[PDB]
Design an enzyme around this catalytic site. Sequence first.
Site, PDB file in Angstrom:
ATOM      1  N   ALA B  99     -16.681   1.794 -42.157  1.00  0.00           N
ATOM      2  CA  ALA B  99     -15.896   2.448 -41.175  1.00  0.00           C
ATOM      3  C   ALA B  99     -16.256   4.095 -41.454  1.00  0.00           C
ATOM      4  CB  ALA B  99     -14.537   2.359 -41.132  1.00  0.00           C
ATOM      5  N   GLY B 146      -8.729   0.549 -44.673  1.00  0.00           N
ATOM      6  CA  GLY B 146      -7.468   0.316 -45.022  1.00  0.00           C
ATOM      7  C   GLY B 146      -6.601   0.289 -44.090  1.00  0.00           C
ATOM      8  N   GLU B 254      14.728 -11.859 -50.145  1.00  0.00           N
ATOM      9  CA  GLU B 254      15.550 -11.232 -50.968  1.00  0.00           C
ATOM     10  C   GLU B 254      15.372  -9.789 -51.079  1.00  0.00           C
ATOM     11  OE1 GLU B 254      16.658 -12.878 -54.553  1.00  0.00           O
ATOM     12  OE2 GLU B 254      17.491 -14.860 -53.455  1.00  0.00           O
TER      13      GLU B 254
HETATM   14  N1  LIG Z   1      -5.505   4.572 -56.808  1.00  0.00           N
HETATM   15  C1  LIG Z   1      -6.695   4.502 -56.374  1.00  0.00           C
HETATM   16  N2  LIG Z   1      -7.147   5.130 -55.152  1.00  0.00           N
HETATM   17  C2  LIG Z   1      -8.154   4.934 -54.876  1.00  0.00           C
HETATM   18  C3  LIG Z   1      -9.046   3.841 -55.333  1.00  0.00           C
HETATM   19  N3  LIG Z   1     -10.302   4.189 -54.477  1.00  0.00           N
HETATM   20  C4  LIG Z   1      -9.967   4.852 -53.613  1.00  0.00           C
HETATM   21  N4  LIG Z   1      -8.860   5.475 -53.820  1.00  0.00           N
HETATM   22  C5  LIG Z   1      -8.379   6.617 -52.811  1.00  0.00           C
HETATM   23  O1  LIG Z   1      -8.410   5.710 -51.537  1.00  0.00           O
HETATM   24  C6  LIG Z   1      -8.609   6.865 -50.448  1.00  0.00           C
HETATM   25  C7  LIG Z   1      -9.837   6.494 -50.008  1.00  0.00           C
HETATM   26  O2  LIG Z   1      -9.712   5.025 -49.549  1.00  0.00           O
HETATM   27  P1  LIG Z   1     -11.070   4.136 -49.803  1.00  0.00           P
HETATM   28  O3  LIG Z   1     -10.405   2.746 -50.529  1.00  0.00           O
HETATM   29  O4  LIG Z   1     -12.108   4.781 -50.756  1.00  0.00           O
HETATM   30  O5  LIG Z   1     -11.636   3.675 -48.632  1.00  0.00           O
HETATM   31  P2  LIG Z   1     -12.059   2.221 -47.766  1.00  0.00           P
HETATM   32  O6  LIG Z   1     -10.513   1.394 -47.459  1.00  0.00           O
HETATM   33  O7  LIG Z   1     -12.974   1.505 -48.359  1.00  0.00           O
HETATM   34  O8  LIG Z   1     -12.527   3.037 -46.360  1.00  0.00           O
HETATM   35  P3  LIG Z   1     -13.890   2.874 -45.643  1.00  0.00           P
HETATM   36  O9  LIG Z   1     -15.053   2.997 -46.746  1.00  0.00           O
HETATM   37  O10 LIG Z   1     -13.710   4.261 -44.939  1.00  0.00           O
HETATM   38  O11 LIG Z   1     -14.178   1.965 -44.585  1.00  0.00           O
HETATM   39  C8  LIG Z   1      -8.748   8.316 -51.354  1.00  0.00           C
HETATM   40  O12 LIG Z   1      -7.398   8.849 -51.333  1.00  0.00           O
HETATM   41  C9  LIG Z   1      -9.130   7.747 -52.834  1.00  0.00           C
HETATM   42  O13 LIG Z   1      -8.823   8.684 -53.573  1.00  0.00           O
HETATM   43  C10 LIG Z   1      -8.758   3.219 -56.265  1.00  0.00           C
HETATM   44  O14 LIG Z   1      -9.410   2.367 -56.796  1.00  0.00           O
HETATM   45  N5  LIG Z   1      -7.469   3.386 -56.810  1.00  0.00           N
END
Ligand SMILES: Nc1nc2c(ncn2[C@@H]2O[C@H](COP(=O)(O)OP(=O)(O)OP(=O)(O)O)[C@@H](O)[C@H]2O)c(=O)[nH]1
EC number: 3.6.5.-
Lengths: 675, 437, 86, 430, 299
Positions: B99, B146, B254
């Site tokens: 995406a 997401g 719950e």
């Molecule tokens: N806590 C945490 N935050 C994460 C992690 N991976 C990504 N993020 C955060 O998630 C956000 C971006 O989401 P991603 O998970 O990289 O994106 P995606 O859902 O794969 O989306 P697309 O690649 O755009 O399709 C940012 O704020 C990142 O810092 C992780 O493993 N843990």
Amino acid sequence: AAFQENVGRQGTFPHGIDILTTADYFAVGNRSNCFLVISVFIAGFPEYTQPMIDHLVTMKISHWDGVIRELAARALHNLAQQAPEFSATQVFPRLLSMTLSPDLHMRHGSILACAEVAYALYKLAAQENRPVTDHLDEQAVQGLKQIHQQLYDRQLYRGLGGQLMRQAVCVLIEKLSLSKMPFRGDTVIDGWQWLINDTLRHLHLISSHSRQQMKDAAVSALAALCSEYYMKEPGEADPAIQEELITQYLAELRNPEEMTRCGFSLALGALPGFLLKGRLQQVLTGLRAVTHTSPEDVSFAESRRDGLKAIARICQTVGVKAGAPDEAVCGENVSQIYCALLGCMDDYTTDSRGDVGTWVRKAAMTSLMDLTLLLARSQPELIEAHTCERIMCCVAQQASEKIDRFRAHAASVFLTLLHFDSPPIPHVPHRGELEKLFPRSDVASVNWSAPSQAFPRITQLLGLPTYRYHVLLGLVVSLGGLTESTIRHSTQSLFEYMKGIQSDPQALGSFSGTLLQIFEDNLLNERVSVPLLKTLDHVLTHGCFDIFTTEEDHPFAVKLLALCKKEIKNSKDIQKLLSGIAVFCEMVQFPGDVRRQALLQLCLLLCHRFPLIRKTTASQVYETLLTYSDVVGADVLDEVVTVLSDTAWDAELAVVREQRNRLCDLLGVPRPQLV
Amino acid sequence: MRECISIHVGQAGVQIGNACWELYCLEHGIQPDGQMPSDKTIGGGDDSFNTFFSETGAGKHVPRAVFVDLEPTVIDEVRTGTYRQLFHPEQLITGKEDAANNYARGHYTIGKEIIDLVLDRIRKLADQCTGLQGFLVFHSFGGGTGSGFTSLLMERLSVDYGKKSKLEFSIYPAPQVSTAVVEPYNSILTTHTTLEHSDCAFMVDNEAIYDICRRNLDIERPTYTNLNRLISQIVSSITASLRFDGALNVDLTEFQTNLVPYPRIHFPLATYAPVISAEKAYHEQLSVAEITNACFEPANQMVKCDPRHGKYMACCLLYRGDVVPKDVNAAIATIKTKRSIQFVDWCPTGFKVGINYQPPTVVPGGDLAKVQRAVCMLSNTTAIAEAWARLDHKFDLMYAKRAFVHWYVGEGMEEGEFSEAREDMAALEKDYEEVGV
Amino acid sequence: FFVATFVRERAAVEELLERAESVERLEEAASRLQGLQKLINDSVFFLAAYDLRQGQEALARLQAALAERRRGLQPKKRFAFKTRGK
Amino acid sequence: MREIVHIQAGQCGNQIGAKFWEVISDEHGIDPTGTYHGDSDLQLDRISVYYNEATGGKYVPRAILVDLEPGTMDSVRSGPFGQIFRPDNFVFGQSGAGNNWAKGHYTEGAELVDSVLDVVRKEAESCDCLQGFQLTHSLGGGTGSGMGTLLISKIREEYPDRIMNTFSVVPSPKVSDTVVEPYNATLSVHQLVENTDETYCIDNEALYDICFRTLKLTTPTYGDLNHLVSATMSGVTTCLRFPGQLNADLRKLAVNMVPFPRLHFFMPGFAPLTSRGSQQYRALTVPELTQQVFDAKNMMAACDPRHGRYLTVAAVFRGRMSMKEVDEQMLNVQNKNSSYFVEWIPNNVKTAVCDIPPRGLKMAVTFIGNSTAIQELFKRISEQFTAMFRRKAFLHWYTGEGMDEMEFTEAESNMNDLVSEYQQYQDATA
Amino acid sequence: LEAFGESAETRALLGRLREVHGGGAEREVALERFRVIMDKYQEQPHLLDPHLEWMMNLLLDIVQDQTSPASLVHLAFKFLYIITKVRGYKTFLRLFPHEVADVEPVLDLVTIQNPKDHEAWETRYMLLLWLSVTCLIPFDFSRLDGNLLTQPGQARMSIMDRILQIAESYLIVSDKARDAAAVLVSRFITRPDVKQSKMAEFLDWSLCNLARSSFQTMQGVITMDGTLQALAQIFKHGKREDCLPYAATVLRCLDGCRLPESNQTLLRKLGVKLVQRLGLTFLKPKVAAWRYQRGCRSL
Ligand SMILES: Nc1nc2c(ncn2[C@@H]2O[C@H](COP(=O)(O)OP(=O)(O)OP(=O)(O)O)[C@@H](O)[C@H]2O)c(=O)[nH]1
Ligand SMILES: Nc1nc2c(ncn2[C@@H]2O[C@H](COP(=O)(O)OP(=O)(O)OP(=O)(O)O)[C@@H](O)[C@H]2O)c(=O)[nH]1
Ligand SMILES: [Mg+2]
Ligand SMILES: [Mg+2]
């Protein structure tokens, strides 16, 4: 090349030499010529009239590109005067059956071809004192009176695809109304009125990219239909039709939608003069409110643009007439129009996009350009002196902004209103000096859009006391911008101009006063205040006001210090604070009590709320102390510089207040209190 | 007996689900292959741990997860990792095009092509269950996938399984770990889309986790590896009731009944204590009153808010270790007599105590120490609304200038959606403010 | 609805080609490809770019399959002079 | 999306293209033969983004050499790394376009675009999932501008959803002495704003001033210009050739560096500045690199960032260093120089770190900015264009090839409206 | 343009190569200026015909001097290649020297060339072309060689064998010099004495190279391309009754190379080209009886 080879090697092609001499490697290069000029020449013979039109109607008109379709339509129009019978008997009915096909592009092309054929037949009949119905039989009149109705029956006007049908129907209606059709007193006119009204009542539902077009295509169609069908007698109109249209349009200029306001504004600027006679003052009062700014209409910048455009449009339709406030421009309505036009000049709107006001300030510049000129060609006496001087001042002011695009339009308008000698303008402040500074011969080769070829020339207007203030305001607001080239060219022109007045005391006693009046005129405006402080700082750093530094407590600096106190006091942004600290440390040079007051203000600003501002003030104080001389006596400058370089200005306030008090005591300055 | 079906979509969502599953099996004793020596019944499943694990006739304890990704990257790590033998090839869905941080490109373009595949997997897995509670979805607001595919799946489940709960564990954006400037737009969009499709969603402020890792754990540059190990512990402590013989929050309903009084106010505030580094493991042991007092400190809170300013609607606590009910009651009474905790006038003002005699557990070599006792406090506080306030500050300044709006217009998404989401957020903020009266 | 009908027509064309054993089978199959192309080129005034790319790829795959079927069912004989035709 | 096709038109574009390929091959360890010989796994973790796997474990380039004459086509094939490319990837004519945009966009270019779109579909067919395009051409030369802008339009018309990125090289009177280069430049812009998605501004005047004043060179040559252009290309694409989370693909980079459709002109910068045959033993610290990368002297465009406002900034630090120090320095730079940053796009400064510094340098820094000051690069063009078009000079070359004054009017209007929009967005909420 | 206006400038630039060959500070600027001045006649190279004879005399006198260093002779070879690509090799090499005395010197130069020197490839290319010009002499190579057994033991290699070895070694390089070799193949293997002693050998080697080369490796492809180009040149500039006895064997190897299924577009073109030259070897040329009565030569 193939045609040339066939004509040179075989010589059997009908009219080979003619079609070979006109259409060659050079003439064929242009597509417009090939589709409009060369096309008619090649079709002039009877051996290329039928197949060419057939191919244009069964292929080019149904192309997959709007440009190609318009080109084919224009070609058919140009080739409709070499074959009236074939265009009115085999091609016109051929198009009437294709206008109902399911394909959108095919329907659009067929509608365009039908409109072009009708226009060509009307033009041909006009040259023989005969009507257009002779060529267009009853069959043609029926289909043409069923294009708009059938389209609405299949809700075909809805959607993106429906937008192209709406545009095609508007063009068809415009062409039919311009060709004078016998549709007076029929439901087709009511249906057309409805469609035009809907197109403008739903312009916010039109693609911004293809919007301005759908609106200039609906107003144009309205101007032809209301001039061929809303006319009961020569110079009149249906009372009933004139009361419903105006009441409906003047009641839509106050809508809550801006697109509808703009559409109705232009729909009111295209009305015929026979339909404004008797109720012109009402429409005038309506657009005046449409070009005004209320507490609720602050972001309606596009509304004022079309309002001003329509206003001047109605002044040029009705013309000027003596003793006729309801029918034309007399002397009873000339003053109100000027006031409404000069009320939009002071219109600077810094919305999310930026100076959207530039669009409203541009349109006004045109409205005057069409007003003062119009009267100059009929009743130049109505052009008052004060109003013309104010217009010339506003134009000169707008001809020095920081926007190259709008600074090129203002200069063009000024040149169009200064050189005008057909006949010339009655009251133009310094028209001899303006002519000498702007030779009509060396004007067409001046790139006003480029700062280099625009600033050096506009700065020469300062010599005229009338435009002095309005040019200095523009130069100030343009000097404190952010572009490098603009500021550089402005400063260069200012320095090359102040050299001839720096030595003269009275010159430096008139310009300085004008600049201090612009500071009292624009204080807390936040548009002229910031750039005016930077300009003053630059002028002081360059070393221009030096003859006044010898005198103690000069009125100029006396009032400048009070203005700076009123301006810099209570702020937030860092640019204003830094710009204020610069002006203060530059004005410190002036001796007398002003020096002590500036030192006190600098000591006060030293303990600003932000450590960055404190450090900047400390650095500027150290610089202005080590630069100038005689500012500190009693041999106490060493201790001052030591305590300034040793004291950490990035610490807390309770630790720096003691150092500030010590520095104040060492400089002989009262210690401010703390409440 | 009932069993849930968890779902993990996105990079942040799948990476946290992997650590959660690792921690879950780490606690259940399930070997990496799937064999559970502690389980004596082969083929039959009716214990507390069966809520998140199925059993084959060989012994293998398969999870009930749905790992969907729009690009082959994070899925490959788990497919060629350590627990690849734990999951099945069918449960590890993978796409192609990403995406690229865009809710529109994931909800009306690259997400409407793989939704049916994920839905067929969510139906085949449910067919092998006599009873289903709901769906625990793991996603993130930052990632456009997401925000788009997760919202689409939630909307489709609301129509398919229209009588099942859908608990959520979203991840809130933070500048020290972010890689997109359009994370407020997608966040607001997914929030507005899920406000009418979820029952209880727990937020995870990345800034709070970063601060906890930089201060408590004493890490110079906390990484996504360390954050996932600290968030997985809290995720397990929250879902400890759905996997052990407890007495509080045993079902998904719950949770909604004890932490979501207002259907639209379903964003509780979670906290976990203590968080001691591995170096300071064998040093001092904090009592229950020690980990209950620190729970109220903003330093340990998951969201950067000020609950002291606002009031509470519901509160509960889940312990893990040798905790005595009398000590917990005494600590709660002392905290109530000391701190000026205020509750809503129309809401019940009581703490739902639930002790779990099982000792804590940590992954070997982790930055977290094997504390003797831990606690996870979930309280619905209005101060959490502040976390949304600042978010709106990032939506008005940009949307006013029409910045990054063409990306959504050219992808089929309309422009009025942003205005609708902003109006929904304003209404939610107004409701939050009214609840504080 | 556009994507739905496009997928339906693509599946229908694939099923018809999978069972094509006549020139009438292939000739009708080569008139559904013309219709689909005409529909798509008349709908690019309101469709996205990803959908257009997917449709183009599907059309290319279907055209390749049709060409392969035509080459297989109708093996064009090798070139040979017309000397001694009878 | 995991394969990018490279294209290069015109002599300068082909030369800039051949230099970038050589640089990325020397950095990845790919010798001229095509076999891997580096010393890091990261070099092979993202090798399929620009190369293709072939028998014997060989890495074949994925570029397409395009021209209208044979000189540059023979110069690159015979270069030190010339053998690396494909013999059927060289598509050129015999006559050139003679510094005429019309000849290169409607005649020779319009005829060779057929063969050009044959090799292009040949590279797209050997790509699991095409990600975008990366063209390297100049806006001054006729063949380099016309036919190259004709290839952008053809790709946008063919491939519906694909990112378009180019490395436009703006000419300069200081380097060349050709009079019809203002016209060949303006028209090109009129296409980019309505075709390309990303476009880097590499002004020639800036390179000349950096080579004559900073590097101390009495006669800067085209060999010095290609030494600065290839380093910038290697620096700006370091995220796409190695692992990373900020800008791993072209779509993310575009979404992060393109706040508006028409506004996408990014002025690049690289530090420390070096030249051919020069080894700087002194290793600059992280603060020094961060302060020098933001200096106007280290900018490849003739625009001062201080005289404008930033919109999107992306910095990359290549070399063994600490991430905490880099983050602290970036935060300090954002706090101190806060007036030079728009406050209506929060979090508009991104920073990345890489463990693969360039060759011959232990510490390197990169800067891809989207400041509104780039408008200055166009205003200069405007003056020349208007001055030459008002008296009708050398116009018969265009009108005699199908073009007309309408196109020049249209391009002038589009470029002028792009300047007004830049000025307005720079003063948003003034 | 209409005529050559930059005459004095070009003359001075050509007379400046003897003081800008050592250091490259004034070597690159001269080349850039020459290229910029020559590119203006890229579309009208016919306007250079009356200047390309005296410029070649000045360029040849520098490379022919024995006291002209390597750096000086290589600079004169780059300008020659530039002029060739500007005007055209077919019209430029025709005016080059073609006497008999120029047969041994030129060849010797080709022997002192390093194929692994990319910084002077222009020297290896143009030189080859010049050799092809010295095979249009109506004498035999045995007459020029004279007595080869002049030294004890180690015998001298004839000019024919040297040319054959040079051609066989450069039809398999990646650089632009392979192409030049194809020019020598159409000027050397088509000679009366060379064909009698270097036609069976050259056709057995080409068949072997075609049989043991793959289109899946970088080298094999280059060798196949060179062999196809050489065969096409032989069948084009060669006789029909000397080349007809080999067209069936060649056709077979070409068909065996399964080229119509390769993703190499240039190999397929060479195969098709070699397929039409072999075919035209099986049929006698005919003449259009329909000429002299249907149109003039021009229009
Ligand atoms: N806590 C945490 N935050 C994460 C992690 N991976 C990504 N993020 C955060 O998630 C956000 C971006 O989401 P991603 O998970 O990289 O994106 P995606 O859902 O794969 O989306 P697309 O690649 O755009 O399709 C940012 O704020 C990142 O810092 C992780 O493993 N843990
Ligand atoms: N930086 C740089 N600029 C170059 C180079 N070669 C040419 N230019 C510039 O490019 C412009 C001339 O365009 P060319 O690249 O020669 O044009 P072309 O693409 O070959 O087109 P035609 O000459 O019309 O066939 C001028 O502004 C030159 O200064 C180069 O190697 N480097
Ligand atoms: Mg991802
Ligand atoms: Mg060229």
